[PDB]
Design an enzyme around this catalytic site. Structure first.
Site, PDB file in Angstrom:
ATOM      1  N   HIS A   1      16.845  36.465  -3.141  1.00 12.06           N
ATOM      2  CA  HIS A   1      17.022  35.148  -3.828  1.00 12.06           C
ATOM      3  C   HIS A   1      18.421  34.911  -4.345  1.00 12.06           C
ATOM      4  O   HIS A   1      18.691  33.917  -5.006  1.00 12.06           O
ATOM      5  CB  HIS A   1      15.900  34.897  -4.864  1.00 12.06           C
ATOM      6  CG  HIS A   1      14.567  34.717  -4.235  1.00 12.06           C
ATOM      7  ND1 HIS A   1      13.401  34.629  -4.967  1.00 12.06           N
ATOM      8  CD2 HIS A   1      14.213  34.712  -2.927  1.00 12.06           C
ATOM      9  CE1 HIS A   1      12.367  34.540  -4.131  1.00 12.06           C
ATOM     10  NE2 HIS A   1      12.837  34.622  -2.869  1.00 12.06           N
TER      11      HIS A   1
ATOM     12  N   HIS B   1      10.044  38.443   6.029  1.00 13.96           N
ATOM     13  CA  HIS B   1       8.639  38.283   6.386  1.00 13.96           C
ATOM     14  C   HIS B   1       8.165  39.182   7.535  1.00 13.96           C
ATOM     15  O   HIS B   1       6.971  39.540   7.579  1.00 13.96           O
ATOM     16  CB  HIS B   1       8.407  36.816   6.712  1.00 13.96           C
ATOM     17  CG  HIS B   1       8.329  35.938   5.489  1.00 13.96           C
ATOM     18  ND1 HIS B   1       7.498  34.833   5.373  1.00 13.96           N
ATOM     19  CD2 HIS B   1       8.940  36.065   4.294  1.00 13.96           C
ATOM     20  CE1 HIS B   1       7.717  34.273   4.185  1.00 13.96           C
ATOM     21  NE2 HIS B   1       8.525  35.023   3.494  1.00 13.96           N
TER      22      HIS B   1
HETATM   23  C1  HEM Z   1       7.556  38.032  -5.117  1.00 14.53           C
HETATM   24  C2  HEM Z   1       8.132  38.094  -3.950  1.00 14.53           C
HETATM   25  C3  HEM Z   1       8.570  36.893  -3.258  1.00 14.53           C
HETATM   26  C4  HEM Z   1       8.191  35.566  -3.382  1.00 14.53           C
HETATM   27  C5  HEM Z   1       6.975  34.986  -4.079  1.00 14.53           C
HETATM   28  C6  HEM Z   1       9.010  34.783  -2.509  1.00 14.53           C
HETATM   29  C7  HEM Z   1       8.856  33.447  -2.317  1.00 14.53           C
HETATM   30  C8  HEM Z   1       9.709  32.601  -1.487  1.00 14.53           C
HETATM   31  C9  HEM Z   1       9.455  31.219  -1.155  1.00 14.53           C
HETATM   32  C10 HEM Z   1       8.215  30.434  -1.648  1.00 14.53           C
HETATM   33  C11 HEM Z   1      10.542  30.792  -0.505  1.00 14.53           C
HETATM   34  C12 HEM Z   1      10.752  29.404   0.082  1.00 14.53           C
HETATM   35  C13 HEM Z   1      10.207  29.145   1.477  1.00 14.53           C
HETATM   36  C14 HEM Z   1      10.760  27.753   1.909  1.00 14.53           C
HETATM   37  O1  HEM Z   1      10.272  26.781   1.248  1.00 14.53           O
HETATM   38  O2  HEM Z   1      11.706  27.593   2.720  1.00 14.53           O
HETATM   39  C15 HEM Z   1      11.384  31.873  -0.303  1.00 14.53           C
HETATM   40  C16 HEM Z   1      12.660  31.812   0.272  1.00 14.53           C
HETATM   41  C17 HEM Z   1      13.445  32.949   0.511  1.00 14.53           C
HETATM   42  N1  HEM Z   1      13.163  34.232   0.140  1.00 14.53           N
HETATM   43 FE1  HEM Z   1      11.672  34.864  -0.988  1.00 14.53          FE
HETATM   44  N2  HEM Z   1      10.029  35.538  -2.068  1.00 14.53           N
HETATM   45  C18 HEM Z   1       9.772  36.819  -2.426  1.00 14.53           C
HETATM   46  C19 HEM Z   1      10.537  37.918  -2.065  1.00 14.53           C
HETATM   47  C20 HEM Z   1      11.629  37.916  -1.222  1.00 14.53           C
HETATM   48  C21 HEM Z   1      12.302  39.132  -0.715  1.00 14.53           C
HETATM   49  C22 HEM Z   1      11.810  40.512  -0.983  1.00 14.53           C
HETATM   50  C23 HEM Z   1      13.365  38.680  -0.009  1.00 14.53           C
HETATM   51  C24 HEM Z   1      14.394  39.414   0.829  1.00 14.53           C
HETATM   52  C25 HEM Z   1      14.951  40.532   0.400  1.00 14.53           C
HETATM   53  C26 HEM Z   1      13.289  37.233   0.081  1.00 14.53           C
HETATM   54  C27 HEM Z   1      14.274  36.397   0.575  1.00 14.53           C
HETATM   55  C28 HEM Z   1      14.238  35.005   0.583  1.00 14.53           C
HETATM   56  C29 HEM Z   1      15.269  34.144   1.156  1.00 14.53           C
HETATM   57  C30 HEM Z   1      16.594  34.558   1.633  1.00 14.53           C
HETATM   58  C31 HEM Z   1      14.804  32.884   1.042  1.00 14.53           C
HETATM   59  C32 HEM Z   1      15.507  31.616   1.432  1.00 14.53           C
HETATM   60  C33 HEM Z   1      15.201  31.064   2.800  1.00 14.53           C
HETATM   61  C34 HEM Z   1      16.100  29.897   3.260  1.00 14.53           C
HETATM   62  O3  HEM Z   1      17.302  29.804   2.835  1.00 14.53           O
HETATM   63  O4  HEM Z   1      15.696  29.146   4.206  1.00 14.53           O
HETATM   64  N3  HEM Z   1      12.292  36.816  -0.766  1.00 14.53           N
HETATM   65  N4  HEM Z   1      10.954  32.964  -1.079  1.00 14.53           N
END
Ligand code: HEM
Ligand code: HEM
Ligand SMILES: OC[C@H]1O[C@H](O[C@H]2[C@H](O)[C@@H](O)[C@@H](O)O[C@@H]2CO)[C@H](O)[C@@H](O)[C@@H]1O
Ligand SMILES: OC[C@H]1O[C@H](O[C@H]2[C@H](O)[C@@H](O)[C@@H](O)O[C@@H]2CO)[C@H](O)[C@@H](O)[C@@H]1O
Ligand SMILES: [Cl-]
Ligand SMILES: [Cl-]
Ligand code: NA
Ligand code: NA
Lengths: 713, 713
Positions: free
Chosen positions: B244, B77
């Protein structure tokens, strides 16, 4: 474009502390306006101004062929925004040329007045500020029309952006009282710090209170707003009657003809506003306030005709051509000249607020005395015009040029000249050792010096440690100053002073003012030693001690701190959150946000809190100069919650056991909440930051001790 | 408290030019972050971060005993606000810790992540910025979980206040498209410069467009938004699937349990927000987005299980416990571990936007390749994660530390190393004389150097004259650059260059990039001589010339000036007034308001206008460096009116005769209208100002020439 202010309209605004950066100022960092002014040929500027008075421009023709009245009003409005509550407003920063004041309805067509002055401004350039020029022009107008002024000082440096001033909460120009953001409550009580009756007015409504044409009721508003601008009854009557000996008002047609104020006008208006569709839009057809009053039979010459007319006729309520309430002399002949047509005369007319000077009983007596003794009226007006136009300039040390009056006036908070040798570095060392050997504590030394020096406000350059007024009424009795503790510290320091002074040869002596500050410095040094650091704090002698008879007790009352977050003090419960009051005080002290941050954290651990409150005292080594405030405030091992008894006090408990570790106020905890403040706290609460904390604290401490030192400037 | 913004909500805002003053910065004026960083023991910082990853804090327990996923999302972010249109947003200033980003709904609970890092920040102090630490932490997360990163550069200095960014005009967080302030028009066309689909989102809505859970349609929004953040299809798939692979989402109960965001929270929350009344409010009960998805069977270890699951199951639309749309694997076994209860397992789940990666036909091909070849996936992700987190860092010269990747990437706009002696002061003088003797005019020389240097933007530190990319596609064909005229000037300078380089010994030579800037310097000196003033303009050699093969033409498109008030240029008709676009360009240039004013007034009289337009050319001595722009603009003898053909062009006529004197645009006449700008124009248009004007112009010209010179930092 949605902004942080839109999303979080109640979050604290720190940008008021970072106005006036070197980024917005076009002059180099080394520009010194005093030095530029002192080389100005002031006499040449005054000749150009005298010439201007009768040099009519077709785009805003001069009434009676002479711009003097317009310029007197211009200067009076420049000065007239001043409030004694905070010192803000006044002529001293030339703010009439910036928003919002350039566009206040009471400032209508003063845009034209300022534009007439551009060629002189351009000719002299940086050697005369706009701020000085506006006042000088007023003076020249008066002199050109036969009135001898009491004097004039230059030295008002120009500013480059608008000041952040609270002018009120109304969202409608000129809103009458009792609305959702009313500045009045109770029995017509005007909210502090305001000094005007409606948003966009200088003092009062010329038709009467909220538009009601009752001179007696208007007099009450006159008296209150002028008192809030530092003027008493005699000065008020002198100023209004003196001003209204000249010129005229403008209300030749309906107000609906008048267009956008300058900040709303189109770009082609080139900074002017209130373009009028009424006839020629100017001159004989001018519309400014909507009133149509000419006070005297010679509007371009000093006369005693204002009070002759006020007392010599009975007055009838009538309306101007724009529909505003004003007064006309019953049965009078047409004796008042027209501003443009020599074949026309008019009857005497008055505003409601002019009639206040006859129908309020306390004004009537002054008005009569002035009517019967016109030399007394002239002298009082000349003194009051000087006061009006210099009230925000600060100590006499800042007055520049060849026309500064020699006479010392009480309102100037005068400090006696120093006439003896000053203490040197050896003497300073000897006096700090004596102070430390006396038994006075770090807390007492720091608190006393802080109390003395932190009365300064940059808004009007009043207050500070010079003068030792902390020992006089009323400062010695202010609750924030801890009167009984203060008395005991002052008696000790005075005994030290008497003993040092009695041992000297030559005329060397130390003032109590210098000794208070020096003793504070010794406290900070001792605190640093308590923490294991070897620090010497800079000290500059040369303060003198003013007398009680040089200290107007009623004028000093506005400097009393009712909120001083630096000492965790709040005199009562207010509608403004305490952290907003903290920022407000820091702005008055001229502090940035890093300076405010550092200062407050250090004061908390030195024992500067009023009543020795433990709120914010986040250390186990009180009276030692450390960054403990920041390191403990930021420790995530502590959880904070408001107390049940008081939502403004917070308890910090260990997160794992629930055990109470600290208590704090809003002022304390904002440093751990506000995202910009917390960023600054983090710097000082880092493991690498102890020496940085100490050095930055010493610098800000010294800055505060010297805020009023224009003798050294 | 009513403010100028309240009264005049459309007046131009100059405070964006005066952020980042030395007033607001707690570090000393001499602090040099690069020098602090270069001494950091980066290896020790990384060991502390590695230890943190599995040291759960009870106030925000670690999912699966491991904070890696939380920190990867934090870093993503931090970088993910970036927009290529203006270069604003990104990780490079650490702005996630200030308003508004600290309180965006997409940034919920990253407050917790940043708080976890305070002890390490506190330990290392000024040697590691927050901005660098955010990124480093995400790299260490990845490394600790078995993923080999591509590298890491330090050097992102911390900032101390929020940036002024246009993030959209909506007044409600997360507002769905088609409202009164819709950021979408036509066939789902997102307005420039925005790069997210809803106010307070990083890119897209994880449920689908405006909440509609259609993976195909979501893919369209993914592709558009990621392209607007400089990522192509391969990089987009690698990033989303790579991210993810780790961690989980949080949606354990209804969203109405979640309280105020940090900027709105109470003071006792000490900078944290989104306090939840759902059960324990954290850990197993956490609510962040409202979604409840865990992607892989090993959330704390790098794997190729995201694509195994994505392709190995069919997906069913379902709802989380908060009611959000999400997907669950049909008929699957409970193979996904629970974050806190080792006796519980769950079925595979996916976001709508994850399924995009399989149901969009172009993504599907890349996703299949990655599924089949996870080593390809790993390399693409590593490269993309480096790009993501460094895209706003600027030239490679600003990279610091021992983990900077040696591979030069095309997106970096790379500049070849200089491997020869540079010209000296005498060489420079010889070249300026040769340029002047060639017959190139002041106008041609000034315009060409301006065109080359003024592509710089401080938001992402792209552009500038280093590289001589003005001679390449696409810059050589930009309309603002006057392509035929440019080509003629460049041919002349290249001939001068070839003749000088052929005459040298010892390998000394001058690059075209340096000669372009030097020739502009010659122009400014000659203009000054035309005015009767001998000045030398500073010049620093050491630029190099980049090749066409080292220049990404599509990436360079966003640097085209479609509005450049300094050349009186507007490529088309926009809904934002031109004066607003001037201030926006000035902010990108890093100019203050005085710098912008000086620069513009000088450029007008030097002949820098595109097409040799006479608009704003308020002089009868064009190509002489004088203050005539200001003296003529401010002349009250001229009256200005909009033309009938174009309301944005103004005629200046003599007020008394009606004679046409000048024409100007809104960008020209804002300097005679805006009350702060006109006060600045007054200083330069005064009779004492010619020397000051010249010196300040030379200084801002040199500043612009050097904006990209991080080799000299
Ligand atoms: C279309 C693009 C993306 C969407 C819509 C998206 C959406 C989200 C959402 C809604 C969550 C959950 C937030 C929460 O409830 O804790 C999340 C978690 C996360 N996202 Fe994404 N994401 C995107 C791209 C990315 C990218 C580019 C990365 C990193 C390279 C990333 C890495 C992560 C990680 C590691 C988590 C887990 C966080 C945790 O374990 O607390 N995401 N994502
Ligand atoms: C109760 C206090 C006062 C009220 C309500 C007040 C009201 C006004 C009003 C409404 C006008 C007419 C503006 C226009 O239509 O052009 C005006 C004019 C003027 N006032 Fe006052 N006034 C006050 C005090 C002052 C003081 C203290 C001075 C200066 C010492 C001053 C000097 C002037 C002068 C010289 C003009 C004439 C302007 C011209 O000739 O263009 N007044 N006053
Ligand atoms: O303005 C008169 C006088 O007021 C104070 O009187 C002091 C006295 O001089 C102190 O040294 C101490 O004993 O407390 C008194 C209580 O009223 C000022 O301290 C003094 O300078 C000034 O002359
Ligand atoms: O005109 C743009 C062009 O200028 C320079 O190249 C020269 C070249 O060195 C000569 O042989 C000349 O006669 O033709 C070109 C001028 O068109 C720049 O250095 C070059 O890169 C650029 O295309
Ligand atoms: Cl002010
Ligand atoms: Cl930004
Ligand atoms: Na003031
Ligand atoms: Na950026």
């Amino acid at each position: 474009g949605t902004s942080n202010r839109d999303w979080w309209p109640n979050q604290l605004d720190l940008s008021i502390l970072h106005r006036h950066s070197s980024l917005s100022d076009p002059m180099g960092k080394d520009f010194n306006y005093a030095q530029a002014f002192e080389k100005l040929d002031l006499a040449a500027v005054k000749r150009d101004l005298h010439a201007l008075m009768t040099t009519s421009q077709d785009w805003w023709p001069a009434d009676f062929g002479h711009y003097g009245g317009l310029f007197i009003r211009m200067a009076w409005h420049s000065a007239g925004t001043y409030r004694t509550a905070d010192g803000r407003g006044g002529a001293g920063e030339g703010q009439q040329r910036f928003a919002p004041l350039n566009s206040w309805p009471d400032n209508a067509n003063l845009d034209k007045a300022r534009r007439l002055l551009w060629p002189i401004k351009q000719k002299y350039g940086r050697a005369i500020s706009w701020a000085d020029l506006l006042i000088l022009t007023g003076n020249v107008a008066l002199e050109s029309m036969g009135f001898k002024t009491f004097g004039f000082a230059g030295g008002r440096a120009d500013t480059w952006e608008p000041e952040d001033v609270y002018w009120g909460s109304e969202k409608i120009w000129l809103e009458l009282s009792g609305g959702p953001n009313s500045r009045y409550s109770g029995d017509r009580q005007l909210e502090n710090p305001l000094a005007a009756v409606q948003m966009g007015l200088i003092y009062v409504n010329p038709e009467g209170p909220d538009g009601n044409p009752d001179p007696v009721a208007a007099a009450r508003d006159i008296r209150d707003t002028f008192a809030r601008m530092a003027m008493n009854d005699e000065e008020t009557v002198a100023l209004i009657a003196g001003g209204h000996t000249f010129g005229k008002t403008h209300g030749a047609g309906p107000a609906s003809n008048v267009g956008a104020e300058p900040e709303a006008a189109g770009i082609e208006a080139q900074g002017l506003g209130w373009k009028s569709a009424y006839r020629t839009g100017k001159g004989a057809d001018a519309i400014t306030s909507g009133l149509e009053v000419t006070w005297t039979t010679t509007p371009t010459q000093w006369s005693h005709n204002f009070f002759e007319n006020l007392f010599g006729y009975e007055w009838e309520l009538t309306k101007s051509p724009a529909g505003a309430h004003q007064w006309v002399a019953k049965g009078a002949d047409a004796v008042i000249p027209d501003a443009f047509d020599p074949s026309k005369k008019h009857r005497p007319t008055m505003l409601t607020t002019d009639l206040s000077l006859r129908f309020d009983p306390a004004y009537e007596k002054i008005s009569r005395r002035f009517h019967e003794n016109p030399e007394q009226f002239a002298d009082a007006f000349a003194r009051a015009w000087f006061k009006l136009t210099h009230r925000d300039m600060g100590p006499r040390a800042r007055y520049l040029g060849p026309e500064v009056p020699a006479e010392v006036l009480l309102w100037q908070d005068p400090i006696p000249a120093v006439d003896h040798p000053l203490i040197d570095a050896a003497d300073a060392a000897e006096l700090k050792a004596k102070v430390l050997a006396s038994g006075l504590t770090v807390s007492q030394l720091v608190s006393t010096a802080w109390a003395a020096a932190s009365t300064f406000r940059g808004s009007d350059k009043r207050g500070g440690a010079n003068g030792a007024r902390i020992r006089l009424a009323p400062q010695k009795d202010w609750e924030a100053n801890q009167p009984e503790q203060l008395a005991a510290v002052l008696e000790t320091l005075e005994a030290i002073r008497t003993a040092f002074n009695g041992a000297q040869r030559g005329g060397k002596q130390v003032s109590l003012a210098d000794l208070i500050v020096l003793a504070g410095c010794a406290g900070v040094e001792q605190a640093a030693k308590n923490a294991g650091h070897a620090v010497t704090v800079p000290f500059a002698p040369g303060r003198a001690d003013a007398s009680q008879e040089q200290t107007d007790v009623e004028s000093m009352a506005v400097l009393e701190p009712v909120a001083d977050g630096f000492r965790n003090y709040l005199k009562g419960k207010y509608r403004v959150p305490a952290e907003v009051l903290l920022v407000d005080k820091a702005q008055l002290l001229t502090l940035s946000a890093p300076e405010m941050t550092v200062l407050l954290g250090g004061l908390r651990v030195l024992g500067a809190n009023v009543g020795q409150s433990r709120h914010g005292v986040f250390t186990a080594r009180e009276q030692a100069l450390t960054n403990d405030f920041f390191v403990n405030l930021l420790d995530m091992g502590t959880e904070w919650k408001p107390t049940a008894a008081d939502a403004d006090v917070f308890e910090g408990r260990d997160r794992a056991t629930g055990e109470l570790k600290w208590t704090g106020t809003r002022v304390d905890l904002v440093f751990g909440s506000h995202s910009q403040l917390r960023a600054l706290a983090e710097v000082y609460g880092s493991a690498d930051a102890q020496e940085k904390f100490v050095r930055d604290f010493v610098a800000v401490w010294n800055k505060v001790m010297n805020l009023d030192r224009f003798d050294l400037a």
